[PDB]
């Protein structure tokens, strides 16, 4: 109703469980509802399909399905009604921005910079492109200093703090890893994320009167990957949990061991009361990946995914 005087910038980046991967329905009159304080830094041609025309970069509403690299906003639900409205797949940005903006003044808004692209990695993935005007290319699957995605992270994050001098930076939401697992290489990701990491570090660092070594909230994976690659789970997650590197913040959702919080159709259930279809009814047509279990599922990032990087988030910045 009435704009905010300036926001807190939170930059969101990684690979697919980063970003819009919940295969369960959109609620946008509840748990997904977009917020007018809340907003993200525009990519796509419009805000969503069949909605306004929006440029790159500019400030529109953060939804459930966000303007990532990779954009899964056609990525529908069977069951979903309002393609207008239930768009896509669901991701956790909308309800860390929500459960955040309890605790900052009146006049703030949340600014959310989505930067992430399903099936990228440091050891794997093309190149693409940079485009001044439009961003990291559809097929910028490469992380590592100075690729596309990450000209694309320095760049957003930049280009949100530049907006309004007093916008201030809450740091990065990091989850990646899980294609780095699969390859022969995979011991190389520490060193190639840390790298990336300095080199982000080093290319903010002017903005520091907007920065409060802004942390890197680094979330964890799916009981698949961390089952299926153990040796290299404890490598390159645990170089997250471990690193030479200040106020990289560890985020994890279960205990050891546990299975849920997945695609899985069984890990996933339906609540008929409040008109939630889990993935259970999504088929080799209409789903993402067919391993279920390699994604968290639209409940889990509405719930203890979200909750547990809001935990991680206030207590950074409470505990200095």
């Not at 041609?45 to 909605?51: D, E, R, S, V």
């Not at 190149?127 to 320095?154: I, K, N």
């Not at 930049?158 to 007093?166: D, H």
């Amino acid at each position: 109703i009435i704009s905010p005087d300036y926001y807190y910038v939170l930059t969101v980046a990684g690979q697919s469980n980063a970003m819009a991967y919940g295969e369960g329905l959109p609620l946008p009159d509840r748990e997904d509802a977009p917020h007018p304080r809340i907003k993200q830094l525009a990519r796509f041609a419009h805000t969503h399909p069949g909605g306004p025309s929006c440029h790159f970069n500019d400030i529109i509403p953060l939804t459930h399905c966000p303007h990532d690299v990779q954009d899964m906003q056609s990525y529908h639900h069977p069951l979903a009604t309002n393609h207008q409205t239930q768009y896509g797949t669901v991701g956790q940005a909308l309800h860390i921005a929500r459960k955040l903006l309890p605790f900052i003044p009146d006049n703030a808004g949340i600014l959310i910079v989505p930067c992430c692209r399903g099936g990228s990695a440091f050891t794997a993935g093309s190149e693409g492109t940079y485009s001044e005007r439009h961003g990291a290319s559809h097929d910028a699957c490469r992380w590592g200093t100075d690729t596309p995605l990450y000209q694309d992270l320095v760049s957003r994050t930049r280009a949100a703090l530049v907006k309004n001098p007093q916008n201030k930076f809450l740091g990065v939401c990091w989850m990646q890893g899980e294609f780095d697992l699969m390859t022969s290489d995979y011991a190389s990701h520490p060193q190639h994320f840390n790298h990336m990491v300095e080199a982000f570090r080093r290319d903010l660092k002017q903005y520091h009167s907007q920065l409060n070594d802004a942390p890197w909230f680094c979330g964890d994976t799916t009981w698949y990957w961390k089952e299926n690659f153990p040796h290299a789970y404890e490598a390159i997650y645990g170089n997250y949990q471990n690193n030479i590197l200040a106020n990289i913040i560890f985020v994890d959702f279960q205990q050891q061991g546990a299975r849920g919080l997945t695609n899985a159709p069984d890990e996933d259930p339906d609540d008929l009361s409040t008109g939630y279809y889990g993935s259970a009814y999504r088929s080799p047509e209409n789903w993402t990946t067919a391993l279920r279990s390699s994604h968290f599922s639209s409940a889990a990032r509405r719930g203890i995914i979200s909750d547990r990087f809001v935990e991680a988030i206030l207590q950074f910045w409470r505990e200095r």
